[PDB]
């Protein structure tokens, strides 16, 4: 129940990855403003379908998506802290 | 008078009475009725975890239904204007004629980003384009979309009101000389139910933005003075200090950057916070809430911190049975403090709205502007108007938690630059909004009463 | 016992050198910032310099001293003037048997806190030292060793440990030992670490 | 003409726009553009495809 | 008692060089906060050998708490409802240290709930 080193390291890794993903999503949402001229919802939806293989932000985006959609064993009620 | 004269005047005439230390004054009891009842709305499953489109559709449908109810209640058939009768229109292309007409539709604004946010996201992406070009290559107008087009909301009533894109309204205006709709009155969603105000009673302490870091040593002395003040050591007026039934840290307990951080210094700050908690718990109850820069999820519905992340000296409080004295709570929560339903948010919704620059509302980062933003958040019945910035994938399915289903008595948005309170009257009801400032800089502590809802501040220098 | 003492002694020496460099104006005070973490949990909010070269210099010096610890019984940070090479201040840190190889870290940090508080209280009473050609030095007093005589075999290195041993044996030169004013301070009386403090002026 | 003048890798409209004009354009598949152009709702999608092709035609000049 | 307190303060100020607070006297002598302030002021008196820096804080009206630094221009001396000595600092930089305290019987205010073990 008590573990403050490995669990906190896992939290640091997960939070770093989540902040990187949010930054990438914000960058794509700002880049998609050229066409949509919108800022609310459906702008992130229109920007989520950009498959421009000539942009380095796209490969990083799909890598972040693959990383977030995996490693479900660490992201659970038992993250080496048992609760 | 000199400093020695003040000491000679005060300490020589010390009372040293009523300090028995054998029969200490019992703190006033303040309970949280939402501790065991059921269904915490903001408690999600992190293991379960674009999904934003379903939330968009649900918000649109619910808000349109509510605004249509309010309109049919206020713009009921027969409500004639000064000259002619007011008509009802289903689509935005049907409002065309020299006659009044009202319709329901969302709001479309510009909402461009601020330069500092763009610079940050560019410097933290490794390949971000010149995002400023997207705003300069392409302006200032509010429009109304209702699934069938848009019209320009011209006039004066539309300018003296803050708006955010996506919000639906019940515009009632008149087409004048082009495809530009005037505005005479605006409708908001129908008023929500509110629990009756209860009819001996104590107060609660509101603290936010401790920001315990490993570089600033001043933020620990203010915290120690706060620890000594709540225990009744500094003020010595146990007849009034014993009325602070609970303590509510509203987020931002530790300040760090997850870009460059390890487990050691975060553990140092967490042990400092745990020392504070262990020293203050035998005298007062604590309700800890996650923040924007704490070791928790970056989204808005942040789960409680952990049973870990605290020193092993607090293992007796986390055994499960001791929850009334220490309660790790979700980031948004509705505390039912002796019937006074208070909705508390760490303050990311307003801080995410303020990171935009809307080229409207002209006809600047002040306390009144943020209070107006909170009042509009309460008016629109949506805690997070900017969903893509605050919300995360899968907040809920078919029943969104941020769409308010019940108005609270006190609405707290913390981690704000300034402090300010405002009571607003929305459809015969009354909600008291409170803006809690950070404790790192301008270390004020808000004392909120529960018998009359009067907030007073306590500064610590 | 060389198990945990090597970290606590490193932290103590880091705080010692940083406090001496800060309170004597050996480096500009703007390059210092009060902190608690410098890759090690510090016992106080110690002003630690954040210069890239100075940090590495201090770390290498402390590692060399800790390597030679088994024969060193005294460590001094001498403050020499620059207009003329003369020791105007000397802060001696005695290591009399150090209760070395032959423990509730909180107590160790409490003793270090007391020692550093004594050092700060002593340093805060000295007159202000002008910048612009004030500097410092480092002198140790060993029991039985001879440095600088390891490069007499061409010592073809195989890894980083041997290279470090060579460059630490070669980084020291020999030296020798009026109105002196000795002022004793508070040391560390914890079991494994029995340290004593001194000071010299004029 | 761009292949003969400048020496870059892909020679697409987005790559040329970024390497010559320093403009980063999003790219949507032919099915996404079709789904946007057939959306009875979401005027944002129609504006999106219109500005998409308008920028593609303006960058050619 | 004015005898145990003086010895404890002298020890924790000169032998174990550390800033001593009045809450330390509360925890060591099992006394109230007002009596601790009285003892701190009494130790501030009879101080022919003064080798410390007193840290004085004062509580104004409207519930404000300040730490006096200049000791020459005290703002709003008429609104002061209390002014006592907070700590004795031997050094210049205050920067105290806070550790775990077992407040088993030194509490003047207890919460309505009891710890369930
Ligand atoms: S990925 Fe490259 S192209 Fe697709 S949006 Fe983000 S920036 Fe624009």
PDB file of C-alpha atoms and ligand atoms in Angstrom, chain A residues 24-25 27-32 47-52 54-59 61, chain B residues 127-129 131, chain D residues 24-28, ligand 1:
ATOM      1  CA  UNK A  24       1.057  18.415 -29.663  1.00  0.00           C
ATOM      2  CA  UNK A  25      -2.741  18.619 -29.766  1.00  0.00           C
ATOM      3  CA  UNK A  27      -0.054  22.827 -31.863  1.00  0.00           C
ATOM      4  CA  UNK A  28      -2.201  20.892 -34.334  1.00  0.00           C
ATOM      5  CA  UNK A  29      -5.314  22.819 -33.271  1.00  0.00           C
ATOM      6  CA  UNK A  30      -3.524  26.124 -33.862  1.00  0.00           C
ATOM      7  CA  UNK A  31      -2.210  24.924 -37.230  1.00  0.00           C
ATOM      8  CA  UNK A  32      -5.725  23.885 -38.289  1.00  0.00           C
ATOM      9  CA  UNK A  47      -7.384  18.672 -36.851  1.00  0.00           C
ATOM     10  CA  UNK A  48      -7.437  15.061 -35.610  1.00  0.00           C
ATOM     11  CA  UNK A  49      -7.795  13.829 -39.215  1.00  0.00           C
ATOM     12  CA  UNK A  50      -4.650  15.528 -40.557  1.00  0.00           C
ATOM     13  CA  UNK A  51      -2.435  12.809 -42.054  1.00  0.00           C
ATOM     14  CA  UNK A  52       0.205  15.123 -43.547  1.00  0.00           C
ATOM     15  CA  UNK A  54       5.382  15.939 -44.621  1.00  0.00           C
ATOM     16  CA  UNK A  55       5.116  17.231 -41.036  1.00  0.00           C
ATOM     17  CA  UNK A  56       7.212  16.064 -38.054  1.00  0.00           C
ATOM     18  CA  UNK A  57       4.358  16.847 -35.647  1.00  0.00           C
ATOM     19  CA  UNK A  58       2.249  14.099 -37.242  1.00  0.00           C
ATOM     20  CA  UNK A  59       4.679  11.249 -36.539  1.00  0.00           C
ATOM     21  CA  UNK A  61       1.349  12.666 -32.670  1.00  0.00           C
TER      22      UNK A  61
ATOM     23  CA  UNK B 127       8.931  21.160 -35.219  1.00  0.00           C
ATOM     24  CA  UNK B 128       6.005  23.455 -34.538  1.00  0.00           C
ATOM     25  CA  UNK B 129       5.322  25.787 -37.492  1.00  0.00           C
ATOM     26  CA  UNK B 131       1.689  29.438 -35.628  1.00  0.00           C
TER      27      UNK B 131
ATOM     28  CA  UNK D  24       2.632  24.476 -43.063  1.00  0.00           C
ATOM     29  CA  UNK D  25      -0.624  23.221 -44.571  1.00  0.00           C
ATOM     30  CA  UNK D  26      -2.684  20.406 -43.038  1.00  0.00           C
ATOM     31  CA  UNK D  27      -3.477  17.471 -45.304  1.00  0.00           C
ATOM     32  CA  UNK D  28      -6.780  15.587 -45.290  1.00  0.00           C
TER      33      UNK D  28
HETATM   34  S1  LIG F   1       0.281  17.852 -37.799  1.00  0.00           S
HETATM   35 FE1  LIG F   1       1.492  19.123 -38.995  1.00  0.00          FE
HETATM   36  S2  LIG F   1      -0.151  19.465 -40.298  1.00  0.00           S
HETATM   37 FE2  LIG F   1      -1.370  18.177 -39.128  1.00  0.00          FE
HETATM   38  S3  LIG F   1      -1.958  19.830 -37.928  1.00  0.00           S
HETATM   39 FE3  LIG F   1      -0.338  19.509 -36.622  1.00  0.00          FE
HETATM   40  S4  LIG F   1       0.875  20.781 -37.817  1.00  0.00           S
HETATM   41 FE4  LIG F   1      -0.766  21.124 -39.122  1.00  0.00          FE
END
